[PDB]
Amino acid sequence: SGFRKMAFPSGKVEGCMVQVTCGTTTLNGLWLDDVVYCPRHVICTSEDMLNPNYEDLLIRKSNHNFLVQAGNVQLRVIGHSMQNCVLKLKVDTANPKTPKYKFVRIQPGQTFSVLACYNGSPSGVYQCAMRPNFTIKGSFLNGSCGSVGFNIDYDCVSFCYMHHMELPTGVHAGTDLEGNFYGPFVDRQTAQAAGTDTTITVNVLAWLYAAVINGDRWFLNRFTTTLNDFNLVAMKYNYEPLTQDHVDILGPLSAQTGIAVLDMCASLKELLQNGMNGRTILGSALLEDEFTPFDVVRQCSGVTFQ
Amino acid sequence: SGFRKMAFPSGKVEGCMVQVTCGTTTLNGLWLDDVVYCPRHVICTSEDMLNPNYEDLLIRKSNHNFLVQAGNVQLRVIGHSMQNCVLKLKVDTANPKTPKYKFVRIQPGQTFSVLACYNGSPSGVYQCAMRPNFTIKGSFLNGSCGSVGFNIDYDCVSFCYMHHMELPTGVHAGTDLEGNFYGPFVDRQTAQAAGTDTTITVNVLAWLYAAVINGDRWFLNRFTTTLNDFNLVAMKYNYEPLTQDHVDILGPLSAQTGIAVLDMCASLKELLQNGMNGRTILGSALLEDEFTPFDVVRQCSGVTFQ
């Protein structure tokens, strides 16, 4: 028992990290088969970032302008193309540690692990949620761009995030591995701000089911609610609306505990309107929204009585 | 910026995990050079657990009675001895992925990463503290015994913890890699209870320095305090006493931020007495004590590992 924010083991990802330098710019790349992926701003300078013309800048670059290092050994670059905001560097060597992998685009509220890297080398691993405003609350310093987020499903690594930039409130923005930004952000030095961040309700409900399972039920009530009513109250408290997909995903936790999703929604509606009277749930003073229902199910491993 | 509960990259440790089966008992082992380390209770059954005579049980086992599996490959066991509560299995093969490593015994309030494993397979990584009562607040299910805790410094993995058992309050007990329990606990089913757990004061101060470095400085007051003043307030809130050694250890963070230790202590004394008035620190409603001063420096410097 016990409940912890937990990341995926980072080893299959550590086997793909490389350093990529262009001119005086260095950041991290991801080496899969004979390709290296990195943020396209590696070809820029600080001065270019004010109004960058990526097509033109890449035109004036040869393969020889990209120095790719996998620890000690240099990788020869044979080709370079841009896909949206990611550079793809074709190399003469296939990564012998390439895991089974896929590129996925994740949805707001879905979690993933981040391997923070500097100069092609891992610094640390932590669990993140894609916020409703298409930011993540990371821990990243200069040199971290090209750090990736990922899930492991079976033995298959699903890469879902590449780090590009930090916004003025200290949250981070990036792309999927096809180089499309999450959210309304661009890889240019211009006034950007993250939108109003909302709370990931399906994750708050997952966490409430976790509370119940680890013994805390002080907040439960006999009342039940309908879904549109809940959503109208949710809206008022900067909570994301709960969709039918979300109700479906909470099915296993509902079944294990015998507490219907709409029952738990009624408990949450109450907690939002009244506050929590300085009482801790699973040792937290605030409702946690970065635990998915799948995260709670894995750690709790409960049975369902039918 | 950003500040996250961050684990060490787990890859060096994932290459050492194996499955150890003895009769019908299966749990995890650690394969370094030609030795496999695991909890000695692998040689027990549910029968033996009440009050097991480990010496007698081990005498009645040959090398042939131990099946060690490293993915698909079976390892030949060539020797076996017991050191305190760990079994050591000599195998015919040195682990070719053995990292630079050492065995250390940590002190209460020191942090480390746990690689949670099931049947020799890594499932999760998370950051933990050794509590003042020599328990850890883990996330472990049946099958997790022999999961290890570790730090990385330089290119060197320091193994500090092996998981043995869960106490009736849902907290976890185990051993260093020489098989000596942390705390007053034994590897038998006996009435055993964790002592009074306190907060790790020096770690809360480290965390306040992290907040400041990241721009969350609302809690800083102009008040200074004596060490004894601070302690006499702190004691009341189930906080460890702060020692001169603790003040010394916070020197680097004090120097980097240009804020005196005893100033920060005065800010903490204020937070303890008055609460946070709704404000959060680094997104958190509660004071966090699972970051050491070295943890804050590593994360804020972007320290990497081989």
From Swiss-Prot, chains A, B:
Residues 1-306 form the Peptidase C30 domain. Residues 1-306 are cytoplasmic. Changing residue 90 to R: In strain: Beta/B.1.351. Changing residue 189 to A: Does not affect ability to cleave and inactivate human TRMT1. Inhibited by pyridone-containing alpha-ketoamides compounds 13a and 13b. In turn, alpha-ketoamide 13b (tert-butyl (1-((S)-1-(((S)-4-(benzylamino)-3,4-dioxo-1-((S)-2-oxopyrrolidin-3-yl)butan-2-yl)amino)-3-cyclopropyl-1-oxopropan-2-yl)-2-oxo-1,2-dihydropyridin-3-yl)carbamate) inhibits SARS-CoV-2 replication in human lung cells. Inhibited ex vivo by michael acceptor inhibitor N3. Inhibited ex vivo by compound 11a and 11b. Changing residue 132 to H: In strain: Omicron/BA.1, Omicron/BA.2, Omicron/BA.2.12.1, Omicron/BA.2.75, Omicron/BA.4, Omicron/BA.5, Omicron/BQ.1.1, Omicron/XBB.1.5, Omicron/EG.5.1. It catalyses: TSAVLQ-|-SGFRK-NH2 and SGVTFQ-|-GKFKK the two peptides corresponding to the two self-cleavage sites of the SARS 3C-like proteinase are the two most reactive peptide substrates. The enzyme exhibits a strong preference for substrates containing Gln at P1 position and Leu at P2 position. The active site is at residues 41, 145. It is found in: Host cytoplasm; Host Golgi apparatus; Host nucleus. 3CL-PRO exists as monomer and homodimer. Only the homodimer shows catalytic activity. Interacts with host FBXO22; this interaction promotes the proteasomal degradation of nsp5. Cleaves the C-terminus of replicase polyprotein at 11 sites. Recognizes substrates containing the core sequence [ILMVF]-Q-|-[SGACN]. Cleaves and inactivates human TRMT1, preventing tRNA guanine(26)-dimethylation of tRNAs. May cleave human NLRP1 in lung epithelial cells, thereby activating the NLRP1 inflammasome pathway. May cleave human GSDMD, triggering alternative GSDME-mediated epithelial cell death upon activation of the NLRP1 inflammasome, which may enhance the release interleukins 1B, 6, 16 and 18. Also able to bind an ADP-ribose-1''-phosphate (ADRP). This is 3C-like proteinase nsp5. It comes from Severe acute respiratory syndrome coronavirus 2.
